Design a protein around this ligand. Structure first.
Ligand SMILES: CO[C@H]1CC[C@@H](n2c([C@@H]3CCCC(=O)N3c3ccc(Br)c(Br)c3)nc3cc(-c4c(C)noc4C)ccc32)CC1
Length: 114
């Protein structure tokens, strides 16, 4: 079993590594707001939205019981952006950069946590 403060200690540096990507992480620091962005179909397409602020709060409150639930939420964030945004868009290419960064940062941590 994984204690929530052990998960936070291990996993939150990989999340801070994503925040440190600037400007690539800027679209991802807060939930998508389809009203502000004038994209009324966003919630038609993205049925399980996720973003860095939601993941951070879940680490902060101990809502992950297992490290793979965290990894899954980060990838859900990525997949939502790749699904909604065109492959030529800045948000799409920024998402791809974040996934490259995350894949590096998460590998030694998950090796440690197993
Ligand atoms: C203060 O909080 C702000 C609120 C919103 C802002 N926002 C912008 C803005 C507005 C439009 C003009 C522009 O050019 N924006 C822009 C700004 C910075 C960068 Br970097 C980039 Br790229 C674009 N578009 C966004 C797209 C997403 C998105 C995702 C993920 N999945 O689907 C979508 C869709 C999410 C947030 C976005 C980011 C931060």
């Amino acid at each position: 079993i994984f204690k929530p403060e052990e998960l936070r200690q291990a996993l939150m540096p990989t999340l801070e590594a994503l925040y440190r990507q600037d400007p690539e992480s800027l679209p991802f620091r807060q939930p998508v707001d389809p009203q502000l962005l004038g994209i009324p179909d966003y919630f038609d397409i993205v049925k399980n939205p996720m973003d860095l602020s939601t993941i951070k709060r879940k680490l902060d409150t101990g809502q992950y019981q297992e490290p793979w639930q965290y990894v899954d939420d980060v990838w859900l964030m990525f997949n939502n952006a790749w699904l909604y945004n065109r492959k030529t868009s800045r948000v799409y290419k920024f998402c791809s950069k974040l996934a490259e960064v995350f894949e590096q940062e998460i590998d030694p941590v998950m090796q440690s946590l197993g």
